[PDB]
Amino acid sequence: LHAQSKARIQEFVRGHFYGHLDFNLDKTLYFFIAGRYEFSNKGADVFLEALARLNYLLRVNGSEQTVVAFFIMPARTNNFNVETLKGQAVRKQLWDTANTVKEKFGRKLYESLLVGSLPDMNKMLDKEDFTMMKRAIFATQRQSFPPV
Amino acid sequence: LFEVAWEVANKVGGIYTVLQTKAKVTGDEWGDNYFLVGPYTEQGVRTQVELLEAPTPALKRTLDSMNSKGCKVYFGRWLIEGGPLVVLLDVGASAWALERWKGELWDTCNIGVPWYDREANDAVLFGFLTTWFLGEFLAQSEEKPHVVAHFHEWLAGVGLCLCRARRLPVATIFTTHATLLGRYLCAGAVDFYNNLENFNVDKEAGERQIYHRYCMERAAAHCAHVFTTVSQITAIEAQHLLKRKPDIVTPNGLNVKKFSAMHEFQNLHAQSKARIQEFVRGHFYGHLDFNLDKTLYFFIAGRYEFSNKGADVFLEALARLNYLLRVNGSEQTVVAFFIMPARTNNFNVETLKGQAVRKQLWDTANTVKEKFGRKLYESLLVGSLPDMNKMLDKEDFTMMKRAIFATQRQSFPPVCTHNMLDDSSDPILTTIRRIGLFNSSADRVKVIFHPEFLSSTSPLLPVDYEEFVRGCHLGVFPSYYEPWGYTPAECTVMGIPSISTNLSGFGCFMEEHIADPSAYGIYILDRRFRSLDDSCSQLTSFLYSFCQQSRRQRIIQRNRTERLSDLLDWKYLGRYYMSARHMALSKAFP
Amino acid sequence: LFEVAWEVANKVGGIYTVLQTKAKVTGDEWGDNYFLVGPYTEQGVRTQVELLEAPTPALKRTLDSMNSKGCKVYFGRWLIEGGPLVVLLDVGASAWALERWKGELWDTCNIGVPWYDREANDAVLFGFLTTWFLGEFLAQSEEKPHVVAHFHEWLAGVGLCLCRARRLPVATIFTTHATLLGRYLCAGAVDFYNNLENFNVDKEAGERQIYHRYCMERAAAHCAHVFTTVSQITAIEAQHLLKRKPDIVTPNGLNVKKFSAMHEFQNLHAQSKARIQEFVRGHFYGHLDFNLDKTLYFFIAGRYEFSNKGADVFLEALARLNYLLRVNGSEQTVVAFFIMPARTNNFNVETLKGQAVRKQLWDTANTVKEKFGRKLYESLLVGSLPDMNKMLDKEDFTMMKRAIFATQRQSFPPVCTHNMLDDSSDPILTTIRRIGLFNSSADRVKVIFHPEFLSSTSPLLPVDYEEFVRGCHLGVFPSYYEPWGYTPAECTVMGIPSISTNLSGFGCFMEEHIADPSAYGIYILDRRFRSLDDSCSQLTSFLYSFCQQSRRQRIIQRNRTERLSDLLDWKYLGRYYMSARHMALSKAFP
Ligand SMILES: O=P(O)(O)OC[C@@H]1O[C@@H](O)[C@H](O)[C@H](O)[C@H]1O
Ligand SMILES: O=P(O)(O)OC[C@@H]1O[C@@H](O)[C@H](O)[C@H](O)[C@H]1O
Ligand SMILES: O=P(O)(O)OC[C@@H]1O[C@@H](O)[C@H](O)[C@H](O)[C@H]1O
């Protein structure tokens, strides 16, 4: 139950970090604090400066481990964040592009296996899927920082 | 109007669907006066007719008289389209007066029936019950209206002459579908169509024990006010056999299922053809060395009749086409399906093995493509491009290599998708072996024999007959002795080209209504005035001509052939029935 | 033949694709004699033209003379269809003799150019280089052949009169696309088409600082042997403005991408429309109270021009249609898309929320259907039927109930799929608010504004412009000041009905070639002889008429409109160019 649920978190964080996924996600730690929105009585502040000290320490040891901290603190809010939903939509669009390309590759591989040969990757290029993948990568580019 | 037929409760022939489709237009024409007469069957009252215990609103006394006099009859609604008013007459209700009836039948039309033929006795008693019902009705109808009687089948028509023996003021119409003795003529190894001027009818009916059946058939034909026949060639054979020229021909019509879009019948052909390809790939694992985008699908369907359906002529025509295609250096390859239901046991192990191998290859492709999708997703997320240096993985190549190793085969693909019970006496396989079609790589014609009705419950070929017909490219029906022909009409309605002969009823009907029947895709032959070699050579020429067109030309041909569905619809064929009924009414009473 | 245009290296206008498509037919006509003249651009030599350092096989001395005399020129092949033989002339290679050239330009056509307009100076030097190249060529060609010069754009045409000033024996053709001053007329809040007989051209060119541009445009038009114009109305406005009646009209042609099947353009409409539905569902979560099978999709595309594209008239016509649909008690609902690229920032949070809600509903349906599939698989394996007493599970109903609870919404759906930078000065939103279209449940017209070019990289609407156009049902283009019109032509090629006006070039061209342009789906208006109210009422009547037809009638309309693609192809439009060239040759030298 921890194995699959963690995956559901990754699909979220990828969506929240489109255009900045420069760290290996297999070496990522997930910390969290939950409960009612109480500042001093729940230790949010101490957790925050402890994480700040950990960040300062991790930039001098030259380590690749990166941690993600969730704050499930129910507060009074209105609407959603446009950037977060945009990131989710971009992740889904990338998934759709990958699905289309993999379906084309599956068709070509099925034909080549039926005729009794091997894929030499000289025809999967197609000079057309590279265009759509290139413009997808162009769309993924971002300049501003991800939201908190 | 009264429709008399033996196929109202049982589906033994195609008359059932013909009557079911004609009921709508006949009811629309005749209002509430349309009544139909048929036998009562225990198996045809459960989900076949809604019995109406209430008396007919316009008829109360005759049913009471009939019930009180001993015979049992039922009224109701046929479970078909439109509003039918059907009557069912029991065959055992009046089985206690067969002796008296045949005693008083000697002086009427002078017909005798063997005692050991239950069906003939049932037909005779049905005719007696029908004529008794007409007599009672006209006695109780105050002679105010005029009654017209229509008879569709010869067993049901035996009572027609009985009415003519009772001086009943009714219009008598006799309609036949085929000659019973003619069916047995074609199995006598004697030419039939080229000797139509000389038949020793009496004896050939005599020693073949079909004498009396033809006897009352001809009696009904002669006594009828008007005589109708399904098609032109059937009319000619009736004139030269029954010695009575039919007044008018009555081709059978079929209801057409229209679509919202004209081109939808093309789309149904697009996907259904795909379902065929997945089959043929499975049947040709390890030998797929030809481009499948340049493949033609021919087929012949119907009951397993060798000479009467033209299987042999199609076979040698395809052999000639194969011989011709190996000297022109063409890449086109054709696949011919034989949907000939025969007696078989179990399946063919090689065919199922091929299906399983195709599915295994699909599974391997799915796994590899899922791995590629994962890798491509990761690379796109990080913001790069697949350079194909990591998709190799040094592991998937191993599984793909052993899959290709498994796909290798040495023996030839089989010609049958089943297991024949007998092989030393099956005409199809003997002819295939004789002409030399073994589905070899160097060949250009493939043969697939599937002796079973196509159904969605079958493990292989998970399509019914309609979808398979819609998926093919050209149906070849070189019929020899075919009264009307339903399968070519069905193919024409579906929107595909067909090959027929003037001998068949459909071919003769089409040849006399549309000029130049070659541009519309209904390739007509001539098996009446030409020898077998000429016919097979013409069929081979037609097959090569079909192979010659491009995809656009084939689309044009199918689109044009689609528009001919309106010709075969009942909306156009009802005119002949109207004319026959009007002529009968004029002959009976002005 | 020589083609002179400024849009050979830069794609600033639609002349690029016109020339690219015309190159094939022009080369096929002229063999290897087809040369094209264009400016040299640093950005248009990388992947835009294959430079040929080798001398022209039929021309060696002129290039050497040109290179030795100081100016730099290049030969090569344009990276377009067919075989093009293009020459690129640098704009800075001969930038050291502008003073001398304009000193000797005073006596030729008497044109003066401001010193602060770099584009005009570049055009003037391009004309000087072109006329110098022609002079060198004819001096070195031994005067054996005859040279014909064709000019497509006014900046490139300034040198044409220069040739006429040098007594060069060539045929002079001047082709224009639109009047520059006419564009600024339409923004002057003064009626333009009803006052075509009286223009104070000199002053209106004077105080608007477009005096000299019109000056050499008119000089080139007058000096040319033949004058051509894109369309009939453009020809009329040129005659009433440039005081020279064009000899013949030259409509622009477009290459058509044919398919294997005629009906394939229908199938591309079938699936693409589906991609629209998945969008609109997402934009109408919690308010889907109308049957989507009876929904019509209208759209207007092109550059963001308010009056010149007829957005306002379309808006009040749709408002009138909405008012009419609420009194007839009809269930038909129409959705109107406005692909009007404007300046925007970010997306709309509600739209993305709706897309996410639709995807979540899809996920819930997928989970429930997978559970149902598992249960049905088990029941079919055991040999039973689903009685629906166990699919309830008392658990999936909870998740479905909370999903339905989440879907509930109270506020109205938004009208824009983006976030406008400004809202107090945007004409579209102000008009929408004024006419009262808020996508309410009781309404019958929905408005969707998408101020961004459609692309496959967009998160919402993952389709490009072509697929979205193919998916709609009727494109409304009530153009007011449109010289030729490319979008309605593209829609007609795609195979969809369109609404245009005689004011537009496409509408005028269609109105004078096909009689009764209503049965083919090209609904023409009359904005020239009618007031605004009459035009909007006629548009509303046309919209209601389109809403009145059934699905079969719409299929007929689209099928018939598809066949008109051959009219707009270059294979038919090349005849006018041939006639113009022949007339020019006859005028120059018999
Ligand atoms: O707990 P982690 O360090 O994230 O390990 C990741 C996953 O943990 C558990 O779910 C299982 O051991 C999995 O086999 C492992 O892949
Ligand atoms: O009929 P064919 O020659 O097999 O053509 C193949 C298919 O035919 C029809 O279904 C359509 O035109 C398809 O677009 C086409 O792909
Ligand atoms: O064009 P419409 O009125 O939306 O019809 C809907 C679709 O149109 C075409 O794509 C085809 O005819 C489809 O068979 C039909 O389902």
Count of C-beta atoms within a 10 Å radius of residue C141: 16
3-state DSSP percent of chain C in helix, strand and coil, to 5: 45, 15, 40
Helix (H), strand (E) at residue C342: none
User: Least CB-CB distance to A105: which of B361, B372, B382?
Assistant: B372
Distance CA C437, CA C319 (A): 8
- What residues contact C387, with CB distance under 8 A and at least 6 apart? none
Tokens coding C6 = 């400024």
- What residues contact B530, with CB distance under 8 A and at least 6 apart? B538
> In chain C, what residues touch B263 (CB-CB under 8 Å)?
262-263, 266
Tokens coding C374 = 């598992």
B485: left (phi over 0), alpha (psi -120 to 50) or beta: left
Which ligand is the nearest neighbour of the Cα of A4? 1
Give strand ranges (E) for C445-518: 445-449, 474-476, 498-501
> Of B41, B94, B40, B42, which is closest to residue B67 (Cα–Cα)?
B94
**Residues belonging to chain A with any Cβ–Cβ distance to chain B shorter than 8 Å:** 14, 18-19, 21-22, 91, 94-95, 97-99, 101-103, 105-106, 109-110, 113-118, 121, 124, 130, 133-134, 136-137, 140-141
C59 pairs with which residues across the strands?
A: C56
Distance CA B84, CA C415 (A): 56
Count of C-beta atoms within a 10 Å radius of residue C284: 21
Distance CA C540, CA B337 (A): 57
Distance CA B12, CA B19 (A): 13
Residues written for chain A:
148
Nearest residue CA, atom 9 of ligand 1?
Answer: A3
Residue C424 burial (C-beta neighbours within 10 Å; 0-12, 13-18, 19+):
exposed
Tokens coding C569 = 């192809």
* Residue that is written with structure tokens 């504004």 in the block: C449
Cα nearest neighbour of A92 on chain C: C459
Evaluate: CB of C578 within 6 angstroms of ligand 3: no
For chains A and B, CB pairs below 8 A equal 77
- What residues contact B186, with CB distance under 8 A and at least 6 apart? B192, B307, B308, B480, B481
Evaluate: CB of A29 within 6 angstroms of ligand 1: no
Give strand ranges (E) for C405-487: 418-420, 445-449, 474-476
Distance CA C481, CA C190 (A): 13
DSSP string across B510-550 = HHTTSSSTTTTSEEEE--SSS-HHHHHHHHHHHHHHHHHS-
Evaluate: CB of C269 within 6 angstroms of ligand 3: yes
Tokens coding C283 = 């934009």
**Distance in angstroms between the alpha carbons of the first and the last residue of chain A:** 27
> Of B508, B510, B529, which is closest to residue B519 (Cα–Cα)?
B510
Which ligand is the nearest neighbour of the Cα of C558? 3
Helix (H), strand (E) at residue C53: none
Evaluate: CB of A3 within 6 angstroms of ligand 1: yes
As a whole number of Å, the CA-based R_g of chain A is: 21
User: Least CB-CB distance to B380: which of A22, A118, A136?
Assistant: A136
Distance CA B399, CA B476 (A): 44
Beta C418-420 vs C344-347: how paired, if at all?
antiparallel
Helix (H), strand (E) at residue B166: none
Beta carbons of C240 and C196 less than 8 angstroms apart? yes
Beta carbons of C365 and C491 less than 8 angstroms apart? no
Nearest residue CA, atom 5 of ligand 1?
Answer: A3
Beta carbons of B462 and B452 less than 8 angstroms apart? no
In order of A67, A85, A86, C235, C349, the CA distances from A147 in angstroms are: 16, 11, 12, 58, 15
> In chain C, what residues touch B261 (CB-CB under 8 Å)?
266, 552, 555
Residue B202 burial (C-beta neighbours within 10 Å; 0-12, 13-18, 19+):
exposed
Q: Which of C380, C555, C557 is the best substitution to test chain B (most B C-beta atoms within 10 A)? A: C555
Tokens coding C266 = 């229908």
What angle is formed at CA B212 by the lines to CA B206 and CA B217, rounded to 5 degrees? Answer: 120
Whole-number Å distance, alpha carbon B558 to ligand 3 midpoint, is: 20
Q: B: neighbours with 3+ CB pairs under 8 Å?
A: A, C
Which ligand is the nearest neighbour of the Cα of C332? 3
Contacts 24+ apart (CB under 8 A), C358-361: C358/C278, C358/C281, C358/C282, C358/C285, C359/A92, C360/C403, C360/C406, C361/C285, C361/C403, C361/C407
Evaluate: CB of A1 within 6 angstroms of ligand 1: no
Phi, psi of B350 (to 5 degrees): -65, -40
Q: Which of C555, C556, C557, C562 to mutate to test the pocket of ligand 3 (most atoms within 8 A of CB)?
A: C555
Tokens coding B506 = 């459909």
- What residues contact A66, with CB distance under 8 A and at least 6 apart? A23, A27, A28, A29
Is C457 in contact with A135 (Cβ distance < 8 A)? yes
Q: Tell me the three state secondary structure of residue C294.
A: helix
Tokens coding C31 = 């063999």
Distance CA C340, CA C449 (A): 7
Is C349 in contact with A135 (Cβ distance < 8 A)? no
Beta B248-249 vs B73-78: how paired, if at all?
unpaired
> Of B383, A89, A13, which is closest to residue C347 (Cα–Cα)?
A89
Q: Which of C360, C457, C461 is the best substitution to test chain A (most A C-beta atoms within 10 A)? A: C457
Ligand 2: lining residues by beta carbon, under 6 Å: B 266, 269-270, 551, 554-555; C 260-261, 264
Position B244: which residue type?
R
Distance CA C13, CA C330 (A): 44
Whole-number Å distance, alpha carbon A3 to ligand 1 midpoint, is: 6
Beta carbons of C362 and C373 less than 8 angstroms apart? no
Tokens coding A6 = 């963690």
Distance CA B161, CA B223 (A): 6
Angle, helices B211-223/B158-165, rounded to nearest 10 degrees: 50
To which CATH superfamily is domain B2-255+572-588 assigned? Glycogen Phosphorylase B; (3.40.50.2000)
Is C261 in contact with B266 (Cβ distance < 8 A)? yes
Distance CA A59, CA A68 (A): 16
Q: Tell me the three state secondary structure of residue C37.
A: strand
Beta carbons of B222 and B246 less than 8 angstroms apart? no
Count of C-beta atoms within a 10 Å radius of residue B359: 12
> Of B548, B540, B549, which is closest to residue B314 (Cα–Cα)?
B540
As a whole number of Å, the CA-based R_g of chain C is: 29
Distance CA C386, CA C22 (A): 65
Beta C73-78 vs C248-249: how paired, if at all?
unpaired
